[PDB]
Amino acid sequence: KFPRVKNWEVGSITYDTLSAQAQQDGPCTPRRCLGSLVFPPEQLLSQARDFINQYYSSIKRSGSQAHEQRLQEVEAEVAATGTYQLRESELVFGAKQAWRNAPRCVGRIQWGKLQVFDARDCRSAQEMFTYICNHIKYATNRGNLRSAITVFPQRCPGRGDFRIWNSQLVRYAGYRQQDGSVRGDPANVEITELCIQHGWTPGNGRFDVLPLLLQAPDEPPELFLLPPELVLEVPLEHPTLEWFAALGLRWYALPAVSNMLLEIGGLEFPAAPFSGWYMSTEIGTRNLCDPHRYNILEDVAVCMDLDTRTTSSLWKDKAAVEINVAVLHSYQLAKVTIVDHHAATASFMKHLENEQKARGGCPADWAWIVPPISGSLTPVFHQEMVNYFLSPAFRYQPDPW
């Protein structure tokens, strides 16, 4: 009943007993595995009882007076109002658990160290903007990055929703040409057009920081320029390839995802931006080298005088490694927190072992934990993993249009 899980580097065997608690049924059946797919009224009370029960076991307080009392108050609150409010500490505990439950996050060794900014008393896009700005400056911290999440008000029936329209707080512009093709980041062509179609004055640049389209309930979104001194960026140079700097590449310091939905105890927060720090392969391999992103691989290989005429020279692999070297070196020189994929996966192995003792397993998504370069050189490659949904959780959600 409990999956046997083997590590093939060492020979060790464990059992994921935690998988027996999974809630939101995933996309797979005995007939066919869909693990590789990117995107797979008083029921509220059931998810609240369960989450409150999680909270008190976490503090060695199950079956104690305050546990009993908190069970009644949510029951009463839902009876009268239909929803309920989370206590401050519960929201902190829920936010950390949702991070701890994220199967595709390799950074979860850090799950206990998270700063939670309670923004549930917010109203209008001007208040949101200041909350976001406090987050960015606290999280950036002059390059000594600190994980943070800002929780805006929980969705309620019969009223609109708080939503940040950008997928991240810092994203670069994507503009077309006299030929369809894109200047800048092609991942952000849609939101770049929704920003121009809302007043913004588009630049002419490859690396123009987009403006925040912030949406207060039942009102049209409102643009906001970000303070340039708040958006910390790292110009990219290579330790030994002097021409690399002249390619003019940059990335931003803070990875801050602003389009996911935080779900705690049956409550839903469609605006709950969280941020950590980058793993270098996210920048160097995916954002810069993906054929549908900045797609720079051949340009670097030409500069390195590599033989791009046959794939068996492994010129793609050689250029990719040096791009990743330049990311790590640039961020370190600028004193901005960054982690390489070897360090990160080794810490995730430690996380798996910790979570085995603490909870009897850990939901992990193999295809996302294994880095996009040098996969079998990291320990997670050789580790079998079980993927399943626990709550609280971060969820994907439709765009607000």
Add this chain to the structure above:
Amino acid sequence: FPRVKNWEVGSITYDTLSAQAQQDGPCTPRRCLGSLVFPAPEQLLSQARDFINQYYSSIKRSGSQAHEQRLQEVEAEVAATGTYQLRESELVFGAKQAWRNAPRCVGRIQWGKLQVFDARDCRSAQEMFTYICNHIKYATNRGNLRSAITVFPQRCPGRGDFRIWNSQLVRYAGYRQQDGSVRGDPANVEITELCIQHGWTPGNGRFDVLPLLLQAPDEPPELFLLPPELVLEVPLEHPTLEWFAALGLRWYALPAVSNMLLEIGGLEFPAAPFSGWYMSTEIGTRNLCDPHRYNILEDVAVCMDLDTRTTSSLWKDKAAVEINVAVLHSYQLAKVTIVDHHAATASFMKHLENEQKARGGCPADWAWIVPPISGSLTPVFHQEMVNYFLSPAFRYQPDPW
């Protein structure tokens, strides 16, 4: 019907073939186990009926006289004997389909070009040896490798199985050492001990080719030395790192897997070794760099004068790329067929497109199709896939000891 997206391009397709998946995999709606390495006449009849229907579809004769006649003939033979026998052309079609259906094979663009040797009249382990040597000779073809399978007699009531105890026809010994380390290939410690127990006089190099342990029905395994001239090998050198040759590394030309079970229409062939040609990352990344295989990564990085004291220099990634370069250059120099992971994954994308037109889908195991270095530099990384089990099929089976 699962919707499947390619993220590099935007293409969208539905896998209608997956609904035909008969035998069941390890995943459920609760939990995905896709990353696990290892996931009555009436039922024999209903598998055979499905294979016969496949065969007569492929020759454009479904529902024809010959088709119904073959169905009745098979039912009659299962009634009289508890089994049935494949016609030669059914066996050929069956072996090709099994390759076509193999979810973890990136080489399936080639599935129609397969030489099938019918050894179903094989009588002893000695004859079995002669068929195997002829296989190795034909498939190696002096370095211009050809894909081939040899099919030994099917499992049948009243007799034991033919088995090849070796996991591949060509494998290097692994000797447990004085201090408890391993000399040679650690993956082969078990089979190396079995060979010695059965009368083999061991060597003590790191690249000693193992004998074959061949089992005839109801017989102990019998040892056979492969003739030196039949095992083509490739000394490994690097095009620009001249000290690399002094590592003394070698690999063999022919990947010939010999411990899998071939299942066709309910019949099982526990001995049916098959062979193709190597993709360079199997040798360079996995066989040479895996910590639990030859584990040469750190020795190579040190020789390259890389900084091995910090992970962020990416010494592992740089050393691995050069090991793969060495493999490709060495095999091309020796004029032995080999494919790099970029060419192989590009041909697999064409296979997926062929198969979507032909059958409405294609079973594929993303975590095995994506190469173990430079994953997102290949197009298969950005392609969603559906994993399921079709028959005819190659299956894992337990070791005979």
